[PDB]
DNA sequence: CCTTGGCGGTTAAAACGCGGGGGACAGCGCGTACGTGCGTTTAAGCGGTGCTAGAGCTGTCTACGACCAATTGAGCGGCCTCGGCACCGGGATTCTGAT
DNA sequence: ATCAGAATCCCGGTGCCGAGGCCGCTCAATTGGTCGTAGACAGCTCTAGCACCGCTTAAACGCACGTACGCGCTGTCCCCCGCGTTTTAACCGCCAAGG
């Protein structure tokens, strides 16, 4: 039969607050990073541990920025995220002018 | 073979002191080594600023004390100052 | 390219963040901000390796570039 | 499908021989020379008839 | 060793060496590295003591880094210290806004 | 004593207007006072500690400059 | 040219900077080209930001640069604003940020 | 205890030569210059200790200016620095 | 007959799909907190004035620190063991919704 | 409430592997001895931080009073959750052109 929405998401929130393993798996992330660096310097190799470092820092970064964005939306008398929420959080932190 | 550094055995002994029945992972030992690195670096940078805002180039323990209670928050800092001061007394009282 | 980021990946990012309900334009906005983040990071990382006169970016240089953006990360010898 | 080929050409800059790799993308008519040593890259247009000696020739004229 | 002569556990002279090669001053006093080493010693004692309690919680014997991140994120002054600090295999607080819990 | 209550509502108004804030709620003022107070607590603690090692019973502008550079809220203008 | 400043054709004292490096506890030794190089970078930064200072002060028919001019010229730049993000100027204030929801329509 | 005042006057006369300045404007400028100098120099010292090089040449200064300032400013600054290196090296 | 360049495989996170249900958004109507003025009261600000800790500043002597040969054993690179977790099936339990 | 049944927790189990013991080195801590000036300290001087008050006045406080955004409610309409259905990002073995 059909389950009622919202439940499975929070249950897997309780599941995904447990294992600190990396969410984005390796190969596509590596290709994206390689396609990026190339724009700064051609023919550049990467130490795989450095790639794991980039992966870790990126994922924790985005998770924390999500936390602030989520609390913005909770303040915004809503439950669902919006892109304007990300703009608000970034405008508070000061990445963009 | 170039000889590399770690602080693993020292804090390893300290861990064995405070918890005899406790194991540890290797990566976490590296994390603690990086921890000591970071705290040491912030302290030393505050020491260099202590020098240049005091126009002096000698480093004594007094500067280390004022550096620690500049960086660390109060209660933790005062306990650490107590530990360091009692160690200063126990060492310099003897040779 | 940038479209190697899957939808359930950013969903899992919401889950470890603990976020419940998801809109639409979130995905492309996420990929954009992630891109600019990695742009600054890997730019000054390759700047470090440029000074290194060597053809592989060190993990050390990655760590120090994170320090240069005030994003100090332990764990990997820093 | 792209062609990744090793060659026996000498890099015009680092002078290491047998260290130039040629990537010929015929779907977009873009050929790419790469040095496995010093890491430089040179790009040039290719047709359907071209071979690693065709773009390596264009690289010699692009320098001089 | 001066550390034993200070009755402590961190090597003095290594630190005295690193103070020299850090361009940290022009001259280096006698007992300043002893004081700094003791500071380090009490800091790591407090941190890993809370980590030991964290392992007592999960009933784990070997320390995983998740224990470390949790014990950082629980205590107040430590978390205000390491605010700009993240750790690989870190994770975050198991935390749920109850306004998003269902009714 | 009670100079925390020396903070006036029209000053908070003026700060909101240069801050660009249009509409002001009434439950704001003492919260503002508390945040301002904790700010200045950490500031003057660090400045006085810098002057503690200075062995001079008077704190200078340079001291406060150095201390606020330590917080990373770094302000120019008065040299340091 | 006796002086190295005249030997560089610049406006800053180089041996000043070299002594600053020596009385810095920065390195142990300092070469000959680095202080010249850094002083040239400084001189470029001064001239570059003083350009925006000159235009921003000329915006108000005033011969003298005020701090408000400097803050305006910084915030009207992009690279300098992301440069000076954690930075505050004395007597600065901020930009005119009038939101569109506020004007009487 | 020297400030950089006439240096500022000469830069100003080289750019907008009909322009005055207040005292505290000069003060903020010298605050600025000292901050920038300290940030670059400390970053160069990080270059040394992260690279085990017992001194610092101009190449370290170039890469540090890359590490601090973003693109357009960085490239124009590298250009000005190398031009100064050139004219000082020629004589 | 033997050794290459292509030409086709099982599997597991990944893209459609519908339907709907619960959450986002416009309206509705009030209403009660809050702008605005006006008069009334107040404290701040400015200008002198005593005015003194005490910082700001200057000789000086020392001891602690900079630095140099022995020495040496602790700290470090390599080897080797076992019980600590990583997962797996059992089984039990607890959410969750339709009832 | 209330049962059925998904979802998760949690208990032996075994395996395997790296944490930790361990052990033989050698190079920096040590130990001891020798110059030296930086600074701990004594002391001189004049500035400026402090306190106080009288006079001026503009700035705050209280209230009178409407009023209009904040908010609770409502209906509504739509478009993400989710579960189902393929489906395509990754690698494994005989062909039929070469030599
Ligand atoms: Zn090459």
From TrEMBL, chain D:
UniProt subcellular location: Nucleus
GO cellular component, as recorded: transcription elongation factor complex
Keyword Cell inner membrane found: no
Full protein name: Transcription elongation factor 1 homolog
Keyword vocabulary terms for this entry: Metal-binding, Nucleus, Transcription, Transcription regulation, Zinc, Zinc-finger
Coarse class of the protein's main subcellular location: nucleus
Covered residues, full protein: 15 to 78 of 110
GO biological process, one term: transcription elongation by RNA polymerase II
GO MF annotation: an example: RNA polymerase II complex binding
Organism: Komagataella phaffii (strain GS115 / ATCC 20864) (Yeast)
Function in brief: Transcription elongation factor implicated in the maintenance of proper chromatin structure in actively transcribed regions.
Chain residues that bind Zn(2+) 1: 11, 14, 35, 38
Highest taxon, organism lineage: Eukaryota
Family: Belongs to the ELOF1 family.
Binding-site residues for Zn(2+) 2, renumbered to this chain: 11, 38
